[PDB]
């Protein structure tokens, strides 16, 4: 259950070493730098639009890592290891490891920003006085909304792929292919939306 994540880790590490050695401003962008850079530009632009860079500079690397670490782990599961691999996000542990860390980080930011005494009050009061009772619950619903989202979206696939296995091979080749084709795009979407939601939670926490 861990090795499936460690593989994605070593993959992204090697990719970062490749970029480090290759990247140049003198020459062409043909190398991998077009992926790392195509992610960095979108994340930079989103955070600059929402919160502005200098108010919250450190959230860019966090966003790009919580994007790639999810994207690679979702896509690599498409390979025909059906038999040993399994999408690590199919286990609650991975989803919590991401979501509760994002939670503690943005709340620590709220504390550093507004202070330990004032930030709780700002979280409880919310945008409306009578909304405050529901605001104190939304404050905890947000991270569950980050976690269960990934968990369900990848576990439905981890289940359907094992369900389709009860057909014979000749019948089986069609639905497995259709589902994995669907899952590539849907996993990309659910990683992008996780990174965007992280950026937005920070946006409404730093203010």
């Amino acid at each position: 259950t861990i090795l499936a994540t460690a593989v994605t880790a070593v993959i992204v590490i090697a990719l970062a070493f490749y970029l480090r050695a290759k990247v140049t401003s003198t020459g062409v962008p043909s190398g991998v730098q077009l992926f790392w850079e195509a992610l960095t530009i979108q994340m930079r632009q989103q955070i600059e639009g929402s919160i502005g860079m200098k108010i919250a500079p450190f959230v860019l690397p966090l966003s790009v890592t919580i994007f790639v670490f999810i994207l690679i782990s979702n896509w690599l599961a498409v390979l025909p290891l059906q038999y040993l691999y399994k999408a690590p996000a199919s286990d609650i542990n991975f989803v919590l490891a991401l979501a509760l860390f994002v939670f503690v980080c943005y709340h620590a930011a709220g504390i550093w920003r507004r202070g330990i005494v004032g930030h709780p009050i700002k979280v409880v009061k919310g945008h409306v006085a009578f909304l405050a009772p529901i605001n104190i619950v939304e404050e905890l619903a947000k991270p569950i909304s980050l976690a269960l989202r990934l968990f369900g979206n990848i576990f439905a696939g981890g289940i359907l792929v094992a369900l389709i296995a009860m057909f014979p091979w000749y019948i089986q080749w069609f639905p497995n292919a259709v589902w994995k084709t669907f899952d590539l795009f849907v996993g990309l979407i659910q990683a992008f939306i996780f990174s965007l939601l992280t950026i937005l939670y920070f946006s409404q926490s730093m203010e």
């Binding site: 861990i2 994540t5 970029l19 401003s25 850079e37 960095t40 890592t65 609650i92 542990n93 860390f101």
Partner: protein, 45 residues
């Protein structure tokens, strides 16, 4: 049969650790060079 898959196991801390080291490695090697490169590329424009 059935394992009540909702309840977390010990693997949680390990996945967190192997995410954290990835985050640090990225923040160092991916982002500084690329931001420098993107800034210079904008100066080229």
């Amino acid at each position: 049969g059935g394992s009540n898959f909702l309840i977390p196991n010990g693997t949680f801390f390990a996945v967190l650790i192997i995410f954290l080291i990835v985050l640090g490695v990225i923040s160092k090697w991916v982002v500084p060079p690329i931001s420098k490169v993107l800034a210079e590329r904008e100066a080229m424009l």
